[PDB]
Amino acid sequence: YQDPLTINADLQRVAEESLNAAVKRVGGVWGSAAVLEIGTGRLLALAPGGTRSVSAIYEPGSVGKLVTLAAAIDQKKVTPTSTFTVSSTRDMPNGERISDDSPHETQDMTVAGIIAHSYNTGTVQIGDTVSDSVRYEYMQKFGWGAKTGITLPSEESGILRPHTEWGDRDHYTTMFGQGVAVTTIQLAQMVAVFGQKGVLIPPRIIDGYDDENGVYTPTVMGESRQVVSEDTAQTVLNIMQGATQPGGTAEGIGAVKGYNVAAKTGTAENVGSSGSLTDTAATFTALIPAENPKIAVAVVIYKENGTVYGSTASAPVFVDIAQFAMREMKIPPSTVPLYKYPW
């Protein structure tokens, strides 16, 4: 007997424990977390025990900025040190007003720092350097709007409306993960690209089988794709290491002692039972150790009639999971510094 599934039992336990505790700590309704082994697509942990991580869809928020960032970089429209002006609000060519989470002093900042702070006013300028059809194409390549094809029941495909349907609001909201709906597994599969030299590897819960007596491992199916170039992947991976740097959205709370973390936070309004934007999903997508990623993690906590933030709600779950996984996988602490671009 060989265990044919990919789940790590102890990691799964840590995942469920942390997630349950955080959903309660924060007064959420539910949560989800997915842990992928980098390079293999092997699913190390999936919480909760339902098919929630596979069937629940929500607007992911600013974790979706990674797609926008990767599109602009891959199309060679901006570099990590390209500067844009950030301000409390910004009025766009099309008449839309974009605002940052909280008012702050107007300043110039690099692309790297814009992502670290997650300034929407800076992000929309990064996104405007590329057309809607191109961004939409990168969204599909990243796996949005499609089932990941994992062999579990009830997987949802999510909602990615054709860009031909995007109005003036959508043009911008889709840049920061609003006006699209994803699953937690889609989030993990997506962030893993940046630790896989731009390659998306479809997630798997079933290893092979021995096939010594009876060939039971699937013929063919699978297939990974190059979403983004190797250089684009490395660059986003470098930029993501700004998350736990001072001023980064994940500072302190997303840090895993002794390991370099690459991360993005998100906080997105979601539609409540009432039919209005009463709810929020707090998201966190991460890669660790950043210098040479071994796992990709996505966490969502959902709260009805309230605000939860990716950093304060979801990052602590990532931390508990990542801390165990590094021991469990016997990964030594980071010997190189956390990457920093000028901001």
Q: Which is nearer to ligand AXL, 274 or 307 (CB)?
A: 307
- Minimum CB–partner distance for residue 190 and ligand AXL (Å): 15
CB 314 within 8 A of CB 28: no
Q: Are 245 and 116 in contact (CB under 8 A)?
A: yes
Q: How far is the CB of 21 from ligand AXL (least distance, A)?
A: 20
- Which residue's CB is nearer to ligand AXL, number 144 or number 176? 176
- Do residues 63 and 177 touch, judged by C-beta distance below 8 A? yes
Query: Between residues 250 and 325, which has the closer beta carbon with respect to ligand AXL?
Result: 250
Taking the complex as a whole, how short is the minimal distance between the CB of residue 152 and ligand AXL, in angstroms?
A: 27
Quick one: the chain helix, strand, coil %, rounded to 5?
35, 20, 45
Whether the CB-CB separation of 132 and 163 falls below 8 Å is answered with: yes
Minimal distance, residue 339 CB to ligand AXL, in Å: 19
Residue 2: half-sphere exposure toward Cβ, Cα within 13 Å = 10
| Residue number, nearest CB to ligand AXL | 62
Residue 269 Cβ, how far from ligand AXL at the closest point, in Å? Answer: 6
d(CA 186, CA 315): 18
CB of 62 to ligand AXL, least distance (A): 3
Q: Which is nearer to ligand AXL, 2 or 102 (CB)?
A: 102
Q: Do the Cβ atoms of 130 and 75 come closer than 8 Å?
A: yes
**Contact positions toward ligand AXL, by CB under 6 A?**
61-62, 101, 118, 120, 176, 249, 265-269, 307, 309-311
CB 286, CB 318: distance < 8 Å: yes
Q: Which is nearer to ligand AXL, 100 or 320 (CB)?
A: 100
Shortest Å distance, C-beta 28 to ligand AXL: 15
CA separation, residue 2 to residues 8, 61, 208 (Å): 14, 40, 10
Strand 279-288 relative to strand 262-270, pairing: antiparallel
With respect to ligand AXL, which residue has the nearer C-beta, 269 or 291?
269
- Roughly what angle, to the nearest 10 degrees, separates helices 132-141 and 65-74? 110
Smaller CB distance to ligand AXL: residue 42 or 135? 135
